[PDB]
DNA sequence: ATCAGAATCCCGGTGCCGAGGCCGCTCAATTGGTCGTAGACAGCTCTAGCACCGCTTAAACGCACGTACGCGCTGTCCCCCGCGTTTTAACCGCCAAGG
């Protein structure tokens, strides 16, 4: 395997990330395992949240993910919601919060 | 009352000798080994007859 | 001028309903206008300051993104 | 000026392989990815300057991912990262 | 006719606006208010539309959060009618004075 | 004889707004913190200055959260605190989901 | 354990807060929220010390963990 | 020293050093640390000036940190600045909701 | 013996300027050192973001000015900008 | 109002201790000198921000009108304040098993 992405069996460009670290004014030198490690973490985070995205979009018989799907999938998670607490999505809205004092009883 | 005893045993991990402390709680039948150096901890059940050599023996078998 | 009064009561109603608010008092609307105004004051002050150092007389979406990240009210969606 | 679009397509085909996406959904996703990357990287730079270590290896990245994400996500991420380290180190 | 002593109107429109996706404040008057605030610190500034849309987005989100905590303040007040000092207490706790 | 209630409490509020000394004294707080950390890492020592830092931050944290909770109850047309008030204040700040 | 928190301690917390009249379940609720607070704090503090490869948590790491939760405290060299 | 040559009180070159070792940029200009040092100088001047007035209030000669927290909590813009800031031996505003005062 | 840092003597002199008849506690001097640390760190972080949202890596005083009036609130900020600008003139007018 | 009496404030007092002066070092600021490209600047080009209007229409405004939660009041009942009474979280000195 010529490319390090094929040498990692992953989907992200590592030397991209290493140049980002170099053109970051982050450290002075950057080792060889840290960019691979961080890119793998990124790839796991993408796949993990896109799981909840897939189920949340499948909730409404629509092949395409909309932003409302993403906000729903975040707020229906616990770890991602405490992750994204200061965070707002464009075209998001919020959850159905109908209080029990409101329904006609 | 709990018994806090120092021993002359060698820690199975950090290899510092005379640095393993044994805390034997007989009220709940729970013995505790502690390393004063690298800071590890091992727990094992004890009876009423046990002594620091009894749980340190159980720690040797728990590793192997 | 007076676009602060361009805020309409039915818009405040719609925001309360998506906000989930059932019952609306009458002494609310201008208070709402004042809070919205002070919010947007601090926002556009910081965005224009970011554009002041940009030496370009036009403010971008990216500018407003960076400025609201500075407030910690950080919003995604448009890149930045 | 590159976005991460086909990377998202390949992750998506690896997870829900019959799923489309809108444009602005991809935009919010790349916003998300950039935010996460910046937060971790800056926290790693804090690790360096709080620890006087003139470079950064993978161990710093592991402890920073611990510092940001909570438990279950953190442990699964540490697992995935070490597995990637393993397979890249083997070849 | 079917005048309907109330209850279905408000909650039904809550159901509609939470089925909803898009904005609520319409574009032009909000834009003109933005430019009036903008005409105060540096004169004569030009804008792209996506900035204004982001401003509108985050504005409505900010007010939605204010309304949510205000709503819970009212529910704790054993009332459904909101009050202004509800909003003042909410912003007191949010540290945004 | 007997004093009438509420008075001594406010008098010691005026007294306890003065000395910034630590309210929870040391040894039990230290035991609680030690019994907590142990759950994260066994055989862990603590720099005593760090213990004082934890103590300071914890006490100021709880005092401020009490202030917001107290103002919630004052808004709630009452004088006495409730646990639901703490839930309301925390729901505004966003600790719990 | 957690019951080392005395009732007049949380009362003194109300007093420096300036709170007059006290209910019942307040005490256990207080101990719970204090617990979760210290849980997150000391968790990432020990994470810092894990990276430190050392067997004592520094006061520095406590300070930096407070910064990481946006709870910046002066006074003790931070 | 450039600080004396700027007629100020904060050491320039220490700050110039710390800007280098902070990975703050790639290159560092000439007088940027002078400007930053003067900013620091006026900030601490204003803060400790109000602290001096706080000591004038209590008729104390040595500054206690309670003076510092009080002078932070009195002024508007300073308190909006240091909103997320607390200080050991801080305390709070001596403050009473008069609706809880008796009748 | 490793040599540690403080800013105590500097702000100490400044305190002696603005109040000759005034003492201070040691812990508060450490607090002020932490204060300078915090303000410096927020400024520098805004400077790095100034760099990356300007795609440049040189730092001049102009960036410091725009950083300060990004962070600090208005009136205080403008007074501080005035102090810094007059100091820039007095230094760079001479060597 | 109004007195008695708790509660607190506030004034010498002394003591002790750390803030501050002070003093002899040495290592980073300085001083000076030498490459170098980043950027301050000149200038080219085409986009897009702006302004304007005509047409469409759905959205706001005013009012008619009942009405029903908000609220002031009430009685009530209960359960925290507080002051009193033990009482138990912390450390200090002779026993009677070892050696
Ligand atoms: Zn060991």
């Amino acid at each position: 395997a010529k490319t390090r992405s094929s040498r990692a069996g992953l989907q992200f460009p590592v030397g991209r990330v290493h140049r980002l670290l170099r053109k970051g004014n982050y450290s002075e030198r950057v080792g060889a395992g840290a960019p691979v490690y961080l890119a793998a973490v990124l790839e796991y985070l993408t796949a993990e949240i896109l799981e909840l995205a897939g189920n949340a979009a499948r909730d409404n018989k629509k092949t395409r993910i909309i932003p409302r799907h993403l906000q729903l999938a975040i707020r229906n998670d616990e770890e991602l919601n405490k992750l994204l607490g200061r965070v707002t999505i464009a075209q998001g809205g919020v959850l159905p919060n109908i209080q029990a004092v409101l329904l006609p009883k | 009352i709990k018994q806090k005893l120092e021993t002359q045993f060698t820690c199975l991990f950090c290899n510092h000798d005379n640095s393993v402390v044994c805390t034997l709680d007989k009220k709940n039948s729970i013995g505790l080994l502690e390393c004063k150096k690298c800071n590890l901890s091992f727990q094992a059940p004890i009876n009423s007859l046990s002594q620091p050599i009894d749980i340190y023996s159980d720690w040797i078998d728990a590793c192997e | 001028r007076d676009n602060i009064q361009g805020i309409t009561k039915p818009a405040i109603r719609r925001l309360a309903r998506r906000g989930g608010v059932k019952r609306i008092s009458g002494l609310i609307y201008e208070e709402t206008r004042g809070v919205l105004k002070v919010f947007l004051e601090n926002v556009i002050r910081d965005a224009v300051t970011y554009t002041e150092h940009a030496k370009r007389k036009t403010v971008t979406a990216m500018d407003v993104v960076y400025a609201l990240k500075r407030q910690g009210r950080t919003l995604y969606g448009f890149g930045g | 000026k590159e976005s991460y679009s086909i990377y998202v397509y390949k992750v998506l085909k690896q997870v829900h392989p019959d799923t489309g996406i809108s444009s602005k959904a991809m935009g919010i996703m790349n916003s998300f990815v950039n935010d996460i990357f910046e937060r971790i990287a800056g926290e790693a730079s804090r690790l360096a300057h709080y620890n006087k270590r003139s470079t950064i290896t993978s161990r710093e990245i592991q402890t920073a991912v611990r510092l940001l994400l909570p438990g279950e996500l953190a442990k699964h991420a540490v697992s995935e990262g070490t597995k990637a380290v393993t397979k890249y180190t083997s070849a | 006719p079917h005048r309907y002593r109330p209850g279905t109107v408000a909650l039904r429109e809550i159901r509609r606006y939470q089925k909803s996706t898009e904005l609520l404040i319409r574009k032009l008057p909000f834009q003109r208010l933005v430019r009036e605030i903008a005409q105060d610190f540096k004169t004569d500034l030009r804008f792209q539309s996506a900035a204004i849309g982001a401003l509108q987005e985050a504005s409505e989100a900010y007010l939605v959060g204010l309304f949510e905590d205000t709503n819970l303040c009212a529910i704790h007040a054993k009332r459904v009618t909101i009050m202004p000092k509800d909003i003042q207490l909410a912003r007191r706790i949010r540290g945004e004075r």
Side-chain angles (χ1 to χ4, degrees), chain A, chain B, chain C, chain D, chain E:
Chain A
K2 268 67 182 298
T3 64
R4 287 177 287 175
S5 297
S6 180
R7 293 174 184 174
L10 294 178
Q11 306 300 318
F12 289 164
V14 183
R16 180 76 57 84
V17 182
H18 187 78
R19 198 181 77 178
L20 290 169
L21 292 165
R22 288 186 289 117
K23 273 88 169 65
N25 291 321
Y26 294 156
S27 76
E28 287 293 328
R29 294 180 71 248
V30 174
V36 179
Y37 195 82
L38 183 59
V41 173
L42 290 170
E43 190 165 356
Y44 177 68
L45 289 168
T46 56
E48 185 72 28
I49 297 174
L50 285 174
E51 176 67 32
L52 295 178
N55 282 318
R58 184 259 195 86
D59 292 333
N60 293 321
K61 274 79 66 179
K62 293 181 182 293
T63 316
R64 299 170 186 175
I65 300 169
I66 74 179
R68 177 69 181 172
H69 294 163
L70 296 171
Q71 182 61 260
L72 285 172
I74 290 303
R75 293 295 187 271
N76 290 317
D77 191 81
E78 185 182 2
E79 277 182 344
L80 298 173
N81 197 2
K82 194 173 181 179
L83 171 66
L84 300 175
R86 300 287 185 183
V87 178
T88 307
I89 302 171
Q91 314 302 317
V94 290
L95 293 174
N97 190 358
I98 298 169
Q99 297 294 320
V101 301
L102 301 174
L103 293 177
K105 60 181 181 178
Chain B
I1 303 297
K2 295 187 188 181
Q3 315 163 244
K4 193 168 187 304
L5 308 164
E6 279 187 345
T7 66
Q8 309 179 47
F9 307 147
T10 289
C11 168
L12 310 184
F13 289 81
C14 71
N15 266 12
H16 280 255
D17 46 42
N18 308 332
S19 68
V20 176
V21 166
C22 186
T23 300
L24 297 171
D25 186 35
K26 290 184 174 179
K27 304 175 180 179
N28 299 276
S29 301
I30 294 181
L32 176 71
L33 286 176
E34 290 173 285
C35 184
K36 316 185 309 186
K37 289 292 188 173
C38 72
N39 291 157
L40 62 80
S41 63
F42 172 77
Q43 204 173 81
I46 63 168
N47 44 49
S48 275
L49 289 60
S50 65
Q51 289 158 110
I53 195 65
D54 281 301
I55 177 181
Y56 182 80
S57 298
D58 288 334
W59 187 24
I60 303 164
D61 315 307
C63 277
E64 304 166 346
Chain C
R1 186 177 65 249
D2 201 75
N3 288 317
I4 179 67
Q5 303 296 318
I7 297 298
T8 79
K9 182 167 74 174
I12 300 170
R13 173 183 292 273
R14 290 189 291 271
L15 290 175
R17 301 302 184 194
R18 181 183 277 177
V21 181
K22 181 177 179 181
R23 182 79 179 278
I24 303 169
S25 176
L27 299 175
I28 304 300
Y29 309 104
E30 297 295 325
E31 189 73 25
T32 302
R33 288 180 177 91
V35 175
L36 176 61
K37 189 172 184 291
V38 171
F39 176 80
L40 294 170
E41 282 180 355
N42 288 317
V43 173
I44 301 170
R45 183 193 303 115
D46 299 329
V48 168
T49 304
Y50 262 157
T51 319
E52 285 169 347
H53 187 273
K55 287 181 179 176
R56 292 180 288 124
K57 298 180 182 294
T58 299
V59 184
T60 78
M62 312 301 284
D63 303 329
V64 179
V65 163
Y66 302 151
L68 293 174
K69 187 184 285 184
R70 176 254 179 273
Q71 286 291 323
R73 297 299 304 159
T74 307
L75 175 62
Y76 291 167
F78 289 161
Chain D
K1 181 63 69 69
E2 300 196 359
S3 177
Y4 299 158
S5 65
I6 59 171
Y7 301 146
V8 171
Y9 281 162
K10 292 176 183 180
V11 172
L12 189 60
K13 292 295 181 182
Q14 284 185 358
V15 177
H16 296 93
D18 291 330
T19 301
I21 190 168
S22 76
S23 175
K24 289 189 175 183
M26 174 59 211
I28 300 165
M29 287 294 290
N30 209 155
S31 304
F32 164 73
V33 171
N34 295 315
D35 188 5
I36 295 303
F37 174 71
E38 287 182 355
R39 289 180 185 178
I40 299 168
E43 197 69 29
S45 182
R46 261 85 58 84
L47 293 172
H49 281 82
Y50 296 159
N51 293 319
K52 296 179 290 295
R53 305 303 299 270
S54 299
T55 182
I56 291 170
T57 66
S58 63
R59 183 176 183 267
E60 292 77 2
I61 311 298
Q62 179 183 2
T63 187
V65 171
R66 292 286 183 88
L67 288 160
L68 270 75
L69 306 171
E72 290 289 327
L73 183 58
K75 189 173 72 176
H76 284 172
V78 168
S79 69
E80 290 293 327
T82 51
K83 179 172 70 178
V85 166
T86 303
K87 190 172 175 65
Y88 181 77
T89 307
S90 63
Chain E
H2 55 280
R3 181 172 176 175
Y4 182 68
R5 293 179 70 187
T8 304
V9 180
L11 279 306
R12 184 185 65 245
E13 291 180 355
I14 290 169
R15 290 181 184 87
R16 184 176 180 178
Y17 291 165
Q18 293 178 357
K19 284 180 183 291
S20 70
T21 64
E22 56 90 21
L23 299 171
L24 288 171
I25 300 170
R26 286 184 297 272
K27 184 176 179 180
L28 175 64
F30 179 75
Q31 177 180 357
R32 291 182 292 115
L33 182 61
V34 166
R35 290 184 185 270
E36 181 179 357
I37 274 89
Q39 203 171 1
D40 300 332
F41 292 159
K42 180 177 172 68
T43 68
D44 191 75
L45 300 178
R46 288 172 63 183
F47 284 136
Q48 298 185 355
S49 66
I52 309 299
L55 287 163
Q56 193 171 2
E57 186 80 27
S59 302
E60 282 190 353
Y62 192 75
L63 300 175
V64 158
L66 178 65
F67 281 165
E68 290 185 358
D69 280 330
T70 308
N71 208 158
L72 290 179
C73 289
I75 292 163
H76 177 61
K78 291 189 265 76
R79 298 180 297 116
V80 190
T81 305
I82 55 175
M83 289 185 77
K85 68 173 183 285
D86 280 313
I87 287 176
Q88 288 187 356
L89 187 67
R91 291 180 63 249
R92 177 62 58 206
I93 300 166
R94 283 180 175 175
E96 300 172 354
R97 284 85 185 275

